[PDB]
Ligand binder design. Structure first.
Ligand SMILES: Cn1c(=O)n([C@@H]2O[C@H](COP(=O)(O)CP(=O)(O)O)[C@@H](O)[C@H]2O)cc/c1=N\OCc1ccc(Cl)cc1
Ligand SMILES: Cn1c(=O)n([C@@H]2O[C@H](COP(=O)(O)CP(=O)(O)O)[C@@H](O)[C@H]2O)cc/c1=N\OCc1ccc(Cl)cc1
Ligand SMILES: [Ca+2]
Ligand SMILES: [Ca+2]
Ligand SMILES: [Zn+2]
Ligand SMILES: [Zn+2]
Ligand SMILES: [Zn+2]
Ligand SMILES: [Zn+2]
Lengths: 523, 523
């Protein structure tokens, strides 16, 4: 019996086709992804293969102005149009709190939404009961397939789920659900979830009864053969894990941003044992036409986005200096604004040991692409912010040792004076450079804002201590020569869209007035 | 023909009786003012004197939780109960914008509200037309008296009137209105307004046809004889000005906070010439009973205030360190919070030459009377803020030369180490002390945030430059040994209530997290 699993993960609001690097589509003849093109390919496969499941491993929420305006209604609408068979909750599905998940996604999706390791307490337990499920048994041809969900146990640090949801250890929660499915004579089981490739391999190894793991969160690209685009594979597709009971369990993921459609064919025997599996993610490039009906519906929904983009978000009473002459040479108030917005975006519920789990921000000055003039009655619109932050990136959370952060600050000024992009704007850090010193030894003072403290204050950076830092995905990936960040980081989780982080902060503040205040000094 | 003018000014929300220093009444047997006691005295005078006018010279708005909750409805209600005959607009009547004045005061007052020097433009001109008047002619016995209003031309820097109101020069605007009254055979004219004692003397001198000036704003106490309480008179009551045409024009004011009722008897001849005048403000002490009906109505309205005082205003995720061990010895995050709230409260409409007219704050650490613990789910209520700021003061705007501010910072640490109240918390200032230096020479660096700049940044304090600073009225009055502030200041305007400034800022922010960030350093 052959099952074809089609899968997406970390689509992150890429409803429209994007450029090759998942930013705004500018050269239509070379654009990729989008739900209209995904619809064409899914429909084609469903005409040819008898047993198909289309699954999403979470993180449809967050990524573009579509999510900013429609707040998940676009996810329910377009996932319903594609006829997804099941979806697991991702961390970003909690960005607008549990209410922003219940309404509109859980109440409007025409497919089960799953997570076996999220437990509710208090009145929320009654409000949400049955709106998401630990698993669903689906009929596929003349057989049934059980799909069990899971979501990152770290979601409380990576989104806004509130204090009435408990995120349990994935393996601990999954095992009893898989054993329950076995008692109900369900012999084909898919674990679909959102914890990252490392956890997916552990689930494949340790959760007895799981036949295949379909994952997400880490934006992992897996491929068997020569890669079709710029993404470098982390391993073969599927990635085979040997389970504790000796079975070979395929693990799949399909990068992010709707650029690829995962495709895995699994051959099962009559007892649900996996005989073999093969496949590869399909690059959704311009060789696949965008479905005209879906494309026309996307164009209709785009009107409200164009209208929103010109509305006032808030006001500034100061000139927002995002010039290269300032932001690539010294502390600039646009850099302070964006770092303050990044820290505000990352305020999460913590225990009594931290005021907040993260207090620090770094931002390459070359990533700030325009100033914003305050003389248009102080108005700031999304279009203005898009000129400052045009790359379509995210502001991510990483864990870096102090030694790595000291190397990053040395890199920030290693060739100072040429208007190069690596000069860092900061938040929660006070740095002093002495440019008369040799490159690599110019950082003379580096103080950081504490997190494990009830009163935030600055203390010297410690080389062996691991710090949480918010920074662009461009830097987390080693952009601008920050290879030490990519190579030495101890954890990396994708954050919210860059423009959205700043837009939300400006709207909350109503009137902003960022100052240059001594975060970066020269001796 | 004898006219008795009863007058109040700068009542500033003191609806209830207060202590002798106009703070919360604690020893009822020695409390003063309040509208219930004012009603008793006004009613008594109106039984005895045939020709009485009860006038208010503005600034009923702002000062206590009454204004915070009722937003001017309490002013219309209780001024109507007292049967005020006329009121001039004060600067604080614009604290909640022109909408917060129109509704509820202008639409609900049963007496004319006046100002001849405020002109509206755009659609507001039609919306507000006739809701306030340049003057009113009132019948008094068998005669008529014209009352012409005026309001501080500096109101755009001292409140939130918006950009659709123009505040003209008082004398320029008043003169044509007084000459118009003379054409209508009104020969007895009172100028009632809110610009301060200095401007009141200029109006008495230069506006031809004005028989008496009844003022406010500067909280001026005038008295003829031995003063009845702790207020020190600035001059006799009335203060006589010789007009340009040789007449003697009495000028009156009655301190502030409803502690006194101004009382002036004027003898006019048949042609409206002033023959003589005499009087004195009446101290509203415990020898005058509170009117039982007004007192019962005040007690009924107080219920909503008690309810509000326990509601959540916002949350803190950090411990708000308002301890004396911190705030009298070093930078404390409660001090940073309050100074940031003071600066946010003073954001006003400026020309293209300033991002804001004021950027600096000083606050005596001894004025911070409690910390606020963040472990009650982060909740902050008005009752918590009242424990931090219990004195019932205001956060005022002053103009100080840099030399005066350097002397204030030397005074801040002149006897450092004894937990004395004069140690300053700051905003928009970065100070460095070297305590090994002799007292009076411990300030080694003092940088201030620019105002006449599009990008706020810090520059060294200049001894000859005049800076605007927000600080408690306690310090503006030379409290805590800051005699140099009282003696050397170049301008002083009373600001908003201390608790209200902080409460509004916390509600706007929703979640606060003030840090200790290096505003005060020790070498
Ligand atoms: C995020 N990012 C970035 O910050 N930068 C910053 O620009 C700087 C280069 O700018 P430049 O010196 O002004 C000359 P340009 O490359 O703009 O021609 C870099 O140093 C770096 O700081 C560059 C690339 C970049 N991402 O590359 C992917 C990408 C490119 C274009 C678009 Cl529209 C969307 C995604
Ligand atoms: C505003 N203010 C103030 O900050 N202080 C600060 O307290 C300090 C004295 O406090 P302490 O060392 O704790 C001994 P205490 O006088 O509380 O017994 C002063 O140095 C100064 O910084 C003092 C008086 C004061 N205003 O005096 C008028 C007033 C007094 C009491 C009440 Cl409830 C209402 C209005
Ligand atoms: Ca099986
Ligand atoms: Ca006259
Ligand atoms: Zn994701
Ligand atoms: Zn994720
Ligand atoms: Zn006043
Ligand atoms: Zn005033």
């Amino acid at each position: 019996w052959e099952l074809t699993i089609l899968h997406t993960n970390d689509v992150h609001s890429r409803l429209e086709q994007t450029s090759e690097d998942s930013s705004k589509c500018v050269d239509a003849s070379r654009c990729m992804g989008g739900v209209a093109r995904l619809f064409t390919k899914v429909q084609q496969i469903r005409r040819a293969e008898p047993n198909v499941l289309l699954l999403d491993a979470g993180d449809q929420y967050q990524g573009t102005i579509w999510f900013t305006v429609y707040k998940g209604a676009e996810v329910a609408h377009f996932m319903n149009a594609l006829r997804y068979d099941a979806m697991a909750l991702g961390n970003h599905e909690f960005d607008n709190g549990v209410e922003g998940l219940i309404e509109p996604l859980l109440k409007e999706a025409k497919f089960p939404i799953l997570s076996a390791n999220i437990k509710a307490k208090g009145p929320l337990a009654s409000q949400i009961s049955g709106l998401y499920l630990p698993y669903k048994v689906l009929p596929v041809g003349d057989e049934v397939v059980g799909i069990v969900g899971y979501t990152s146990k770290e979601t409380p640090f990576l989104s806004n789920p509130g204090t009435n949801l408990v995120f349990e250890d994935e393996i601990t929660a999954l095992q009893p659900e898989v054993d329950k499915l076995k008692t109900l004579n369900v012999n084909k089981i898919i674990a679909l979830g959102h914890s990252g490739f490392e956890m997916d391999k552990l689930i494949a190894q340790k959760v007895r009864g799981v036949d295949v793991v379909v994952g997400g969160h880490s934006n992992t690209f897996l491929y068997t053969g020569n890669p079709p685009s710029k993404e470098v594979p982390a391993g073969k597709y599927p990635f085979i894990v040997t389970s504790d009971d000796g079975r070979k369990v395929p693990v799949v993921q399909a990068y992010a941003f709707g650029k690829y459609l995962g495709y895995l064919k699994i051959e099962f025997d009559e007892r649900g044992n996996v005989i073999s599996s093969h496949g590869n993610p399909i690059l959704l490039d311009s060789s696949i036409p965008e479905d005209p009906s879906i494309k026309a519906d996307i164009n209709k929904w785009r009107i409200k986005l164009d209208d929103y983009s010109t509305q006032e978000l808030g006001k500034t009473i100061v000139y927002l200096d995002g010039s290269s002459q300032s932001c690539r040479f010294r502390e600039c108030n646009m850099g302070n604004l964006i770092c303050d917005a990044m820290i505000n975006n990352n305020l999460r519920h913590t225990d009594e040991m931290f005021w907040n789990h993260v207090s620090m921000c770094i931002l390459n000055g070359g990533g700030i692409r325009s100033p914003i003039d305050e003389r248009n009655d102080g108005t700031i619109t999304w279009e203005n912010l898009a000129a400052v932050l045009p790359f379509g990136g995210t502001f991510d959370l990483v864990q870096l040792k102090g030694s790595t952060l000291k190397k990053a600050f040395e890199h920030s000024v290693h060739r100072y004076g040429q208007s190069t992009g690596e000069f860092l704007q900061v938040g929660g850090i006070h740095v002093v450079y002495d440019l008369s010193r040799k490159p690599g030894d110019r950082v003379v003072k580096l103080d950081v804002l504490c997190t494990s403290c009830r009163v935030p204050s600055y203390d010297p950076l410690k080389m062996d201590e691991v710090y949480k830092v918010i920074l662009p995905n461009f830097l987390a990936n080693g952009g601008d020569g920050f290879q030490m960040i990519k190579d030495e980081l101890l954890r990396h989780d994708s954050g919210d869209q860059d423009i959205n982080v700043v837009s939300t902060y400006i709207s909350k503040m109503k009137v902003i007035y960022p100052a240059v205040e001594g975060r970066i000094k020269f001796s």
